[PDB]
Design a protein around this ligand. Structure first.
Ligand SMILES: COc1cc(C(=O)Nc2ccc(S(=O)(=O)N3CCCC3)cc2)cc(C2CCN(C)CC2)c1
Ligand SMILES: COc1cc(C(=O)Nc2ccc(S(=O)(=O)N3CCCC3)cc2)cc(C2CCN(C)CC2)c1
Ligand SMILES: COc1cc(C(=O)Nc2ccc(S(=O)(=O)N3CCCC3)cc2)cc(C2CCN(C)CC2)c1
Ligand SMILES: [Cl-]
Ligand SMILES: [Cl-]
Ligand code: NA
Ligand SMILES: [Zn+2]
Length: 315
């Protein structure tokens, strides 16, 4: 005939908390659809006295929740919260040790790519546009990176345990970063075809694929031209607080004081292991929870990050 109730809050953003009177004879699922209590799926659980006043995540299935989700995450996909909460149930059980002053991740579920990306973000000037990434990145820097890692996986449409790529991950994250004032001018000189200047803005201005060396990029890299000859491409001008230089993994020497940090990738095309190298008073190799130092480093490098502000060529 009737039922005892308690009050809970529902949310999509953990900023707007919506009061609900819940029926203790029904599951959360029967009342809200998919329901989460800090990452755990409580869809098939009934309300208990200890739930009173707690905050539960639900999917944005009305105009109020869609707008709160859009404003906080910058996403229009209602399955986003599903992917976030699913990932969060795993990432909350990972460990985030401080290693050489940075939040790292102890190895689990092929998360070596996320560890190296997390370590990279803490050493380059990058501000996120979605309030969700601002809030979770701040917590990650203080050593609580579970929410941040879960958000990265949701934004990249990757599940816990999927193999990942640092370059691919940084590329998705950069789309959600404020890079509008980033600018790159390239010149391409071909003996036959002549000169062509190109101006790039945003992500295209901070990422390059084909050489690991910022110095080589400034001096000139050879690339095929449509005449069938090789042309030379060189960086004329750079306005950005960092650049990311990427290439297929190859044996490469990293020299102390000449870069910020780098990603090493050992193994093969379809599986392998990432490590992070950082240039401090010496070269530190961070491998999840593990730390080794050396004055020199040679290894298979895929990505090198360099600090920048303003560069103009003298060529
Ligand atoms: C009582 O039954 C409901 C069901 C759902 C639902 O979204 N179901 C649903 C299942 C699987 C999936 S899923 O498999 O696609 N996946 C996406 C992420 C997590 C699960 C998505 C949605 C939602 C409601 C609420 C609708 C709004 N009012 C105000 C409150 C009730 C009631
Ligand atoms: C609480 O204040 C509101 C916020 C938004 C919103 O969509 N905000 C919002 C921000 C950034 C972004 S964004 O960063 O993802 N980006 C994508 C395209 C343009 C901006 C998207 C959405 C919408 C409303 C409603 C007020 C009354 N209703 C009937 C109409 C809308 C209220
Ligand atoms: C182990 O040997 C590797 C070789 C390559 C390669 O050349 N990939 C590759 C991608 C796009 C492009 S491209 O689309 O950007 N474009 C540029 C020139 C040709 C196509 C070019 C090359 C890539 C990998 C990665 C495989 C797994 N990830 C996690 C890390 C390393 C490993
Ligand atoms: Cl930020
Ligand atoms: Cl640097
Ligand atoms: Na940073
Ligand atoms: Zn040419």
């Amino acid at each position: 005939a009737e039922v005892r109730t308690i009050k809970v809050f529902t949310t999509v953003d953990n900023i707007n908390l919506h009061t609900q009177v819940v029926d203790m004879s029904m599951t959360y699922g029967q009342q809200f659809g998919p329901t989460y209590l800090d990452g755990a799926d409580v869809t098939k659980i009934k309300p208990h006295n200890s739930h009173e006043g707690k905050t539960f995540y639900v999917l944005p299935n009305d105009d109020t929740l869609r707008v709160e989700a859009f404003e906080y995450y910058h996403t229009t996909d209602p399955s986003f919260l599903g992917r976030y909460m699913s990932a969060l149930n795993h990432t909350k059980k990972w460990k985030y040790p401080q290693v050489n002053g940075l939040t790292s991740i102890k190895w689990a579920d092929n998360n070596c790519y996320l560890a190296t990306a997390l370590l990279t973000l803490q050493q380059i000037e990058l501000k996120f546009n979605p309030p969700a990434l601002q809030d979770a990145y701040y917590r990650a820097r203080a050593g609580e990176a579970a929410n941040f890692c879960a958000l990265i996986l949701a934004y990249c449409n990757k599940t816990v345990g999927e193999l990942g790529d640092v370059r691919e991950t940084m590329s998705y994250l950069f789309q959600h970063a404020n890079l509008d004032s980033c600018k790159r001018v390239l010149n391409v000189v071909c003996k036959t075809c002549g000169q062509q200047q190109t101006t790039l803005k945003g992500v295209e201005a901070v990422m390059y694929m084909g050489t690991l060396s910022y110095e080589q990029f400034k001096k000139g890299v050879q690339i095929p031209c449509t005449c069938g000859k090789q042309a030379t491409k060189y960086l004329v001008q750079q306005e950005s607080p960092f650049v990311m230089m990427s290439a297929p993994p190859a044996q490469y020497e990293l020299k102390h004081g000449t870069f910020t940090c780098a990603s090493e990738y050992t193994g093969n095309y379809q599986c392998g292991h990432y490590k992070h190298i950082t240039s401090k008073e010496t070269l530190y190799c961070i491998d999840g929870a593990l730390l080794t130092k050396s004055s020199e480093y040679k290894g298979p490098i895929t990505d090198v990050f360099y600090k920048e502000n303003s560069y103009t060529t003298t060529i």
